[PDB]
Amino acid sequence: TCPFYKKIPGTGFTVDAFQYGVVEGCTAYFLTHFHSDHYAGLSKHFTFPVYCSEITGNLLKNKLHVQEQYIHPLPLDTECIVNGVKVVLLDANHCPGAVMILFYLPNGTVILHTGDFRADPSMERSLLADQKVHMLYLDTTYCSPEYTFPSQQEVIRFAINTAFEAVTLNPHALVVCGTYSIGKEKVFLAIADVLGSKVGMSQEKYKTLQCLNIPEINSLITTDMCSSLVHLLPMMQINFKGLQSHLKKCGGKYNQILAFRPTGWTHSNKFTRIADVIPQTKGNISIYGIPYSEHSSYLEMKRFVQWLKPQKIIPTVNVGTWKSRSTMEKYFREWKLEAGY
Ligand code: NI
């Protein structure tokens, strides 16, 4: 059955709760963003109202084939009424179309559900600052002090300079970027922009990108692999074997590959700075691991929560074991004692 952390008290609303069949009492299902864990169970067969951003609606319509009658897209940064209750969608700084949702309950309680997010200080001057938030449903993916990472901009700058140098040294090199869902699009778009190229990709991936309201998209992406010097491949193909194989397929138009694997955190965040990063190399193929994160680091999460000062925190990630929950509760108490709420 639908867990209490996906239910909004004193409404018949749920959030990211599609895998449990019909939820008893639920009159509106919210979807924070288009990642399969969150949408799991949604298909052309679903027949209840889904509330979401415009981008998330395009994806539901076109990729999942959810019938149009059940998609209720809402604009960002706008007070809307849903089944008698005031809501606002805010940018989550996660993947394209990802939202946080603010719920103003009839009793006067205010609840923020973050969805998946990368906390940022720009969120301190949104509509959130206008009133007290009593309850917070929090993306706790990286809720432990070991999880540090560089800013997105430091990582993109590194990617840009690396790719530009390699292709100026060898104008017959191909750049490859690995991908598995939506998100982290700036990696491949910034590399292509410094090389004066479009990004080449499969028909399924192109169809996905065409839904995302990216300005001038038709000038940035193509399905003609031949004509482009940055290609997108599935993350699973980002290895020496898969990349040699791809290079055979391109018809001797390239004689070298430089590949990027954008990942989350891995253990080498605890020593290395972005400027020290060196690739793995086998022959005419190099692979760079770059920690481009679309989740809050420990320090970014702590800052946001210490600013917000919620009366109660409800974790939404890593809640499956008592050890994880206990560990998280400890950090929430420390933050509360330091900041005086
Ligand atoms: Ni996500």
Curated annotation (Swiss-Prot):
Its main location: nucleus. The keyword Iron does not apply. Keywords: Cell cycle, Cell division, DNA damage, DNA repair, Hydrolase, Isopeptide bond, Metal-binding, Mitosis, Nucleus, Phosphoprotein, Ubl conjugation, Zinc, Zinc-finger. One of its GO terms (cellular component) is nucleoplasm. One of its GO terms (molecular function) is 5'-3' DNA exonuclease activity. The keyword GTP-binding does not apply. Disulfide bonds: none annotated. Signal peptide: none annotated. It comes from the Eukaryota. Expressed in brain, heart, kidney, liver, pancreas, placenta and skeletal muscle. It is found in: Nucleus. Induction: During mitosis. The mRNA encoding this protein contains an internal ribosome entry site (IRES) in its 5'-UTR. This 5'-UTR generally suppresses translation while specifically promoting expression during mitosis, when cap-dependent translation may be impaired. GO terms for biological process: cell division; double-strand break repair via nonhomologous end joining; interstrand cross-link repair. May be required for DNA interstrand cross-link repair. Also required for checkpoint mediated cell cycle arrest in early prophase in response to mitotic spindle poisons. Possesses beta-lactamase activity, catalyzing the hydrolysis of penicillin G and nitrocefin. Exhibits no activity towards other beta-lactam antibiotic classes including cephalosporins (cefotaxime) and carbapenems (imipenem). Belongs to the DNA repair metallo-beta-lactamase (DRMBL) family. Binds constitutively to TP53BP1. Binds CDC27, which is itself a component of the anaphase promoting complex (APC). Binds PIAS1. This is DNA cross-link repair 1A protein. It comes from Homo sapiens. The gene is DCLRE1A.
